[PDB]
Design a protein around this ligand. Structure first.
Ligand SMILES: [K+]
Ligand SMILES: [Mg+2]
Ligand SMILES: [Mg+2]
Ligand SMILES: [Mg+2]
Ligand SMILES: [Mg+2]
Lengths: 48, 92, 95, 74, 52, 49, 31, 143, 354
RNA sequence: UCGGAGUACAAAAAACCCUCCGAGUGAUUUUAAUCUAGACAAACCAGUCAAAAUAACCAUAACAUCACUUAUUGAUCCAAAAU
């Protein structure tokens, strides 16, 4: 019973660490999506 | 409403003018009640409501008026939109 | 409270409770606020309104009054034109 | 604590929420009512570089005012 | 100085009385209360003395 | 309940129905001592009567 | 609150003077 | 059946002014210990600097919707001076026209007690009343 | 356990000592101006603007529009001052100004306001009503060119359409006319859309008018893509916003993929997405003008559903959330007799075995 | 018996024949309504606030004020008065 607890605890910590890494990549990939989804700013650049 | 021959011709047309919100596309006047749980009372309410609609429309002299809180702002928003309408130039 | 009377041997009731309480069939008891007729000019408008309202009694008071009255007053009554007739039964009580 | 947005004030200086929502506490500036002679006098004597700050209690509404639903399709 | 408690009856004819504390040295008091019976403000005058 | 009694044969519409027939049909119980003056008709099942 | 970093944000009594009220018995032009 | 008859049970309206124009939106009731009261949909803000007269109409979010001030070149070249009683009248009339153009017909103005008796402000509101803009916003329905 | 503040305190700049030297406010109107200027700064502590929806605070607005006209400030500064001095020296103006008897040519101010600061004032009007949010999302444009839309209602009466106005559908039954100053060297595109009013989809907008490749001022001579359709707001949900969009295009663009049938009455074919539409032809077109109005329900809407759209008229209603009540206790304590009525399901009495 | 400050230093509560101030009502008019969501407080009895809605009056008007404002007060039964 003690051995199974060690395996269970080791996997949950490892699995939890993987989830945080996925969220960090997801947040960065979402940020570049907004940059590559807006419109080409004409603005004052038309006369520039 | 058009083929309802138990009401007079002036009364029939006045119902359409006042209650045009309840008139279906095919000319079917629709009245609905939801007060009581027993369907006998619900039907009785509809008939009594129908009597009041006909009774007030039947009388030519029956033309009551009232002033409401929403009427005051309705008149103002109607008056304000007439300020811009006053210009009279050749249109399209 | 006389648990056993000396004439018939049944359980008597306290006449003080019935003269100033109303029992609904759901077990709830009804009473008037204390001091609703004393010194009305002194109290504010809100305070007078609060004192003129019927109130319910908590579990201990409700349980206390059930042991002070016999079983005649806990019966189901169908009065004619009773204002409290619609409050007799509880409804939509999820305990 | 002074009342803020969506928070009333009783005659006994108690704060009660007016709309269903989340209670929030905030430090804001204080601009007293001109009809309050004592409060406006305190503001008058303040130096030019200072502003009064007071704590406030807010209730950000959660439920919307209402929604539109189809009741009849004539 | 002691005050007097007097009962004021409506002058609108309806039966409505509310007690008001009044100073003893003052003469008969006359106010403008609001009786719910008529749902309108009506004149009220002092009628009887109840408590000192 | 009045419809329920008739369907099960507790009372019969062929014979006139009064208070006595209801008691013999075990429909309602009347206690004269407890200040009961009879039976009042309510409209709980007017839709399916 | 004391422990919060925003403590004392409402301090004002050190901005205005004390402004000693002219007491009935202590009314004197102490110059 | 008819492909054109498909209607969603719930209709979502994204117009921010829809609730305000129906007098059903929430007014930020409260405060009371501060001034001015922030229980409004639109507030008229009049600022009298020593050189220019500026009048603002603000939403409760802090944004300014329509503004008419003597600092504009359009109004400056038609006024003799920007700090007169006549200048306030011009500001009031110009803002009154723009509010009608912007659809804002109701606003709340809470003047300072001494400004309420001031000659310029007294006649400034007279221009607004005759300009079509009406103060005293309608009461909220089911407040 | 005292903690260190995260930044400068509000009133720590002034010196506590030597109060008499510091000049006071002496007025109440000075404090309000000072307080309001202080209330808009981004303080490090919690503020009212933080919790009550300041719309993400500072936003990097993307500008997609015509560049502002090139104006020389040096020349403008001298000519503006020179014009004022001539008006200043007029004695008759001083006579009227002192006696509080003078008026201004409001029509002249209207013409100059449109040219000078009209584009900027209309920009915040669109932002306040959220036109940019529902059309270009975060992007915004300045209405550089003036635009006029008017409806022919009577024999000669003319209902105008300004920014944020209110127009009854009866006035909008007929097609409007658009007048704007432009030389015969470029092309323009006109688009009228119903931002709110789509039935099945809440994020889509209808199209009521679309004219492609307008030669200069004459709108009629331009190629027509989508025929005009009178507004049809629902009876329940009122005050739908209709926006006129003017696009300036360099080259003749092939607007054939968005072509609609001439007797187009299928609302499924009127589904439109301005951001998607502008995405395809971003290189060619460029927004230049804007004019939008509010529109509620009227009697003329009814015939649109029946005769034109061949649709049963839908009616909505404003429904409020049900009132909240606490969980019912078996023995209510010190509660009024009406405590049971709150949790009653129906007022009709219900009998059981009886 | 009732209120305020310290003891009780920062949510609440917290004692002594403990240390110090008070209350057992006046002045004035703005004479302050009816009805109900939701809560603080509390052994109980009591005490407190209160949106919406209706009426009153600027014709879309409810906090009586001031005196440290906080205390200025008494349950049933019973008796008297118009009910
Ligand atoms: K919509
Ligand atoms: Mg029985
Ligand atoms: Mg509690
Ligand atoms: Mg109210
Ligand atoms: Mg006794």
């Amino acid at each position: 019973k003690f051995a199974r607890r060690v395996v269970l605890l080791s996997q949950e910590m490892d699995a939890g660490l993987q989830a945080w890494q996925l969220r960090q990549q997801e947040k960065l990939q979402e940020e570049e999506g907004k940059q590559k989804n807006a419109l080409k700013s004409k603005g004052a650049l038309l006369q520039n | 409403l058009a083929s309802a021959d138990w009401i007079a011709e002036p009364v029939r047309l006045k119902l359409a003018v006042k209650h045009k919100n309840r008139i279906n596309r095919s000319g079917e006047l629709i009245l609905t009640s939801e007060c009581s749980r027993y369907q006998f009372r619900n039907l009785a309410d509809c008939l009594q409501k129908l009597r009041d609609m006909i009774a007030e429309a039947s009388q030519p002299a029956k033309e009551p008026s009232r002033e409401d809180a929403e009427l005051r702002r309705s008149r103002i928003e109607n008056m304000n939109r007439e300020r811009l309408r006053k210009k009279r130039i050749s249109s399209a | 409270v006389t648990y056993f009377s000396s004439r018939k041997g049944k359980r008597k009731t306290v006449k003080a409770v019935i003269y100033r309480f109303l029992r609904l069939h759901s077990g709830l008891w009804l009473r008037r606020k204390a001091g609703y007729k004393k010194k009305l000019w002194k109290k504010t408008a809100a305070r007078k309104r609060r004192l003129r309202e019927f109130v319910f009694c908590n579990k201990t008071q409700s349980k206390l009054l059930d042991k002070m009255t016999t079983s005649f007053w806990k019966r189901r009554n169908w009065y004619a034109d009773d204002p409290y007739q619609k409050y007799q039964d509880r409804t939509n009580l999820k305990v | 604590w002074h009342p803020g947005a969506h928070v009333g004030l009783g005659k006994n200086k108690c704060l009660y929420a007016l709309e269903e929502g989340v209670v929030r506490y905030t430090k804001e500036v204080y601009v007293p009512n001109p009809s309050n002679s004592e409060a406006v006098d305190l503001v008058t004597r303040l130096p030019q570089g200072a502003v009064l700050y007071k704590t406030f209690v807010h209730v950000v509404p959660a439920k919307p005012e209402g929604t539109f639903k189809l009741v009849a399709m004539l | 100085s002691k005050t007097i408690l007097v009962k004021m009856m409506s002058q609108a004819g309806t039966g409505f009385s509310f007690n008001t504390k009044r100073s003893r040295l003052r003469e008969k008091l006359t106010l403008l209360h609001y009786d719910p019976v008529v749902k309108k403000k009506v004149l009220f005058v002092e009628q009887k003395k109840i408590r000192s | 309940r009045l419809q329920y009694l008739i369907d099960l044969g507790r009372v019969d519409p062929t014979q006139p129905i009064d208070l006595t027939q209801l008691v013999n049909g075990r429909g309602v119980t009347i206690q004269p001592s407890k200040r009961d003056y009879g039976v009042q008709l309510v409209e709980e099942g007017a839709d399916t009567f | 609150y004391r422990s919060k970093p925003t403590h004392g944000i409402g301090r004002y009594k050190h901005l205005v003077k004390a402004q000693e009220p002219k007491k009935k018995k202590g009314k004197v032009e102490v110059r | 059946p008819v492909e054109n008859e498909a209607v969603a049970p719930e209709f979502t309206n994204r117009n921010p002014r829809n609730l305000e124009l129906l007098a059903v939106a929430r007014k930020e009731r409260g405060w009371g210990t501060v001034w001015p009261s922030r229980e409004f949909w639109h507030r008229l803000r009049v600022i009298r600097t020593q050189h220019h007269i500026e009048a603002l109409v603000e939403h409760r979010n802090g944004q300014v919707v329509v503004s008419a001030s003597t600092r504009e070149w359009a109004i400056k070249k038609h006024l003799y001076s920007t700090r007169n009683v006549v200048a306030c009248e011009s500001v009031g009339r110009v803002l009154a026209e723009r509010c009608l153009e912007a659809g804002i017909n109701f606003m709340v103005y809470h003047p300072t007690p001494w400004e309420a008796a001031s000659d310029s402000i007294k006649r400034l509101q007279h221009a607004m009343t005759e300009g079509g803009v009406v103060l005293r916003e309608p009461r909220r329905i089911y407040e | 356990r005292r903690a260190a503040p995260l930044g400068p305190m509000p009133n720590e700049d002034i010196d506590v000592s030597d109060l008499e030297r510091l000049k006071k406010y002496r007025s109440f109107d000075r404090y309000r101006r000072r307080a309001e200027q202080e209330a808009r700064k981004p303080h490090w502590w919690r503020t009212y603007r933080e919790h009550f929806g300041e719309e993400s605070g500072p936003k990097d607005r993307v500008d997609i529009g015509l560049p502002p006209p090139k104006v020389s400030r040096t020349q403008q500064l001298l000519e503006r001052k020179q014009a004022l001095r001539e008006l200043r020296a007029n004695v008759e103006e001083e006579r009227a100004a002192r006696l509080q008897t003078a008026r201004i040519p409001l029509e002249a101010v209207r013409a100059e306001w449109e040219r000078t600061c009209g584009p900027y004032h209309k920009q915040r009007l669109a932002e306040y009503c959220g036109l940019y949010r529902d059309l270009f999302h975060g992007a915004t444009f300045v209405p550089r060119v003036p635009l006029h839309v008017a409806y022919a209602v009577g024999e000669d009466d003319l209902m105008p359409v300004y920014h944020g106005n209110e127009v009854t559908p009866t006035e909008a039954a007929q097609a409007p006319e658009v007048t704007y100053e432009a030389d015969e060297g470029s092309l323009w595109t006109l688009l009228l859309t119903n931002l709110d009013g789509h039935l099945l989809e809440p994020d889509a907008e209808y199209v009521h008018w679309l004219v492609t490749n307008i030669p200069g001022n004459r709108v009629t001579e331009g190629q027509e893509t989508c025929p005009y359709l009178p507004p049809f707001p629902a009876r329940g949900s009122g005050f739908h916003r209709f926006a006129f969009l003017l696009f300036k295009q360099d080259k003749r663009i092939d607007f054939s993929g968005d072509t609609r049938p001439s007797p187009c009455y299928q609302l499924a074919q009127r589904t439109f997405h301005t951001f998607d539409f502008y995405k395809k032809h971003q290189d060619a077109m460029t927004p230049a003008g804007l004019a939008f109005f509010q529109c509620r329900w009227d009697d003329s809407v009814t015939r649109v559903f029946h005769q034109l759209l061949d649709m049963r008229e839908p009616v909505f209603e404003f429904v409020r959330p049900p009132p909240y009540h606490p969980k019912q206790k078996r023995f209510p304590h010190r509660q009024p007799l009406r405590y049971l009525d709150r949790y009653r399901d129906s007022h009709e009495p219900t009998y059981g075995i009886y």
